UniProtKB/TrEMBL annotation:
Shown part of the complete sequence: 1549 to 1730 of 2188
Subcellular location: Host cytoplasmic vesicle membrane; Host nucleus; Virion
Family membership noted in the UniProt record: Belongs to the picornaviruses polyprotein family.
Subunit and partners: Interacts with protein 3CD. Homodimer. Interacts with host GBF1. Interacts (via GOLD domain) with host ACBD3 (via GOLD domain); this interaction allows the formation of a viral protein 3A/ACBD3 heterotetramer with a 2:2 stoichiometry, which will stimulate the recruitment of host PI4KB in order to synthesize PI4P at the viral RNA replication sites.
Protein name: Genome polyprotein
Domain Peptidase C3: 1-179
Tree of life domain: Viruses
Stretch forming the signal peptide: none
Role, per record: RNA-directed RNA polymerase: Replicates the viral genomic RNA on the surface of intracellular membranes. May form linear arrays of subunits that propagate along a strong head-to-tail interaction called interface-I. Covalently attaches UMP to a tyrosine of VPg, which is used to prime RNA synthesis. The positive stranded RNA genome is first replicated at virus induced membranous vesicles, creating a dsRNA genomic replication form. This dsRNA is then used as template to synthesize positive stranded RNA genomes. ss(+)RNA genomes are either translated, replicated or encapsidated. Capsid protein VP0: Component of immature procapsids, which is cleaved into capsid proteins VP4 and VP2 after maturation. Allows the capsid to remain inactive before the maturation step.
Length: 187
C-alpha cells in the first residue's frame, strides 16, 4: 500500500498555501522558517501564506553546476511559527521509488492525496521550455493547480510537483544536503 498515514502527517504540520503573482501553490515547510516552492512561481519580496502577506527574507532559486535550473526555490519567511524539522525525512541521494503519494494543499484542495505509483529518476526535462535537471517522473495524469504538491513514500519526502503534460507528472528532487547549515555572497 501507499504511505497515506505518512503523507497526512507531513501535510498536517509542514504545508501551507502560498500565493504569488502566478497563483496558489502547495508549499512545503522544511525547518524553522524555511520552505520550498517551484521556481516558476516567481517569488518576490512578499508572499501570501494562508492568505497572510508575509515578507520573503531570502529566496534561492537552485541551479546545478552546469548552471541548469533545478526548479526548486528555497525561501526564508518572516513568520512567527517554526516548521517542524523534517530534514531527516529527506533522501540523501538520487533514487527511484515505489508507490508514492502526491499531496496537495491549496484553497481549492485543502487536503487531497493522489497515489501516483512508481517514481523514477528521470534526469533531464525540458519543462515548459526551460532545461531542468534532477527530475523525478511518475506515469500519472497530474493536473493544473498541483504544482508544489509534496511527493512522499513512507518515511521519505522525495520532491515537489513541478509539471506534467496530461500523461506523465514530474517533481523536482529534494535532497538532504540542500538544507544543511553552513560565507557566500549569493545575490
Ligand atoms: C502546476 C503549476 C501550478 O500548479 O500553478 C499554480 C499557479 C502545473 C502542473 C502540470 C499542468 C498539467 N499537468 C501537470 O502536472 N505545471 C505546469 O503547467 C508547468 C509549469 C512550469 C514550468 N508547465 C508549463 C508548461 C509546460 C509544461 N509541461 C512540460 O513542459 C512537459 C514536458 C513533458 C514531458 O511533460 N510536461 C508544464 O508542466
Ligand atoms: Na490568485
Ligand atoms: Na536560502
Ligand atoms: Na543524511
Ligand atoms: Na475558495
Ligand atoms: Na524520454
Ligand atoms: Na510550453
Ligand atoms: Na486550478
Ligand atoms: Na507517455
Ligand atoms: Na544540518
Ligand atoms: Na540537518
Amino acid at each position: 500500500g501507499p504511505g497515506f498515514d505518512f503523507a497526512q502527517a507531513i501535510m498536517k504540520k509542514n504545508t501551507v498555501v502560498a500565493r504569488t503573482e502566478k497563483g496558489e501553490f502547495t508549499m512545503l515547510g522544511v525547518h524553522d522558517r524555511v520552505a520550498v516552492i517551484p521556481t516558476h512561481a516567481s517569488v518576490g519580496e512578499t508572499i501570501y501564506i494562508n492568505d497572510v502577506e508575509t515578507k520573503v527574507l531570502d529566496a534561492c532559486a537552485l541551479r546545478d553546476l552546469t548552471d541548469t535550473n533545478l526548479e526548486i526555490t528555497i525561501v526564508k519567511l518572516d513568520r512567527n511559527q517554526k516548521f517542524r524539522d523534517i530534514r531527516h525525512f529527506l533522501p540523501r541521494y538520487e533514487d527511484d521509488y515505489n508507490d508514492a503519494v502526491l499531496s496537495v494543499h491549496t484553497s481549492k484542495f485543502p487536503n487531497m492525496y493522489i497515489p501516483v505509483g512508481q517514481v523514477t529518476n528521470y534526469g533531464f526535462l525540458n519543462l515548459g521550455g526551460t532545461p531542468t535537471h534532477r527530475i523525478l517522473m511518475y506515469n500519472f495524469p497530474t493536473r493544473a493547480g498541483q504544482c508544489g504538491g509534496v511527493v512522499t513514500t513512507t518515511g521519505k519526502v522525495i520532491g515537489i510537483h513541478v509539471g506534467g503534460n496530461g500523461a506523465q507528472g514530474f517533481a523536482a528532487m529534494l535532497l538532504h544536503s540542500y538544507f544543511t547549515d553552513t560565507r557566500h555572497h549569493h545575490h
